[PDB]
């Protein structure tokens, strides 16, 4: 069951539709009741591969997503769109494997420092 409080800040239509998935989902589907989030802010940062690197001339997009618990909660940052960097620490789905985004996140850090780590990753 979805925590009740997770419906406090939710638009009335989204409440009915969420509960319909909880209670009478379509065949083969189950709501992840721990997955519900509200008051998310997001934006996209365009990123150019740096001169002299393996990514020179490449145009990437970085999606930043901030939960209602940011900055205590780490931001969700991933590469998005049709051109995703080819790098061991980036998955095909755009997911980024950097510790700053997981174990080493702290509200002392910032969007700027995440950008710098990502720049660093691509060199
Ligand atoms: Na997070």
Swiss-Prot record:
It is an enzyme of class 2 (transferase). It comes from Homo sapiens (Human). The active site is at residue 97. Residues 9-123 form the UBC core domain. Homodimer. Interacts with FANCL. Interacts with STUB1/CHIP. This is Ubiquitin-conjugating enzyme E2 W. Changing residue 97 to S: Loss of ubiquitin conjugating activity. Widely expressed, with highest expression in brain, liver, pancreas and heart. The chain holds residues 1 to 117 of 151 of the full protein. The lineage of its organism: Eukaryota, Metazoa, Chordata, Craniata, Vertebrata. Keywords: ATP-binding, DNA damage, DNA repair, Nucleotide-binding, Nucleus, Transferase, Ubl conjugation, Ubl conjugation pathway. GO terms for molecular function: ATP binding; ubiquitin conjugating enzyme activity; ubiquitin protein ligase binding; ubiquitin-protein transferase activity. Pathway: Protein modification; protein ubiquitination. It is found in: Nucleus. Belongs to the ubiquitin-conjugating enzyme family. One of its GO terms (cellular component) is cytoplasm. Accepts ubiquitin from the E1 complex and catalyzes its covalent attachment to other proteins. Specifically monoubiquitinates the N-terminus of various substrates, including ATXN3, MAPT/TAU, POLR2H/RPB8 and STUB1/CHIP, by recognizing backbone atoms of disordered N-termini. Involved in degradation of misfolded chaperone substrates by mediating monoubiquitination of STUB1/CHIP, leading to recruitment of ATXN3 to monoubiquitinated STUB1/CHIP, and restriction of the length of ubiquitin chain attached to STUB1/CHIP substrates by ATXN3. It catalyses: S-ubiquitinyl-[E1 ubiquitin-activating enzyme]-L-cysteine + [E2 ubiquitin-conjugating enzyme]-L-cysteine = [E1 ubiquitin-activating enzyme]-L-cysteine + S-ubiquitinyl-[E2 ubiquitin-conjugating enzyme]-L-cysteine; S-ubiquitinyl-[E1 ubiquitin-activating enzyme]-L-cysteine + [acceptor protein]-N-terminal-amino acid = [E1 ubiquitin-activating enzyme]-L-cysteine + N-terminal-ubiquitinyl-[acceptor protein].
């Amino acid at each position: 069951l979805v925590p009740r409080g997770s419906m406090a800040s939710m638009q009335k239509r989204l409440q009915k539709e969420l509960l319909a998935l909880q209670n009478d989902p379509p065949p083969g589907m189950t709501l992840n009741e721990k997955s519900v989030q509200n008051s998310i802010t997001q934006w996209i940062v365009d990123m150019e591969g740096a001169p002299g690197t393996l990514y020179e001339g490449e145009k990437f997009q970085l999606l930043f997503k901030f939960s209602s618990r940011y900055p205590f909660d780490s931001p969700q940052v991933m590469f998005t769109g049709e051109n995703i960097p080819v790098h061991p620490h980036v998955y095909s789905n755009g997911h980024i494997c950097l510790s700053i985004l997981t174990e080493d996140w702290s509200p002392a850090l910032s969007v700027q420092s995440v950008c710098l780590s990502i720049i660093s990753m691509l060199s």
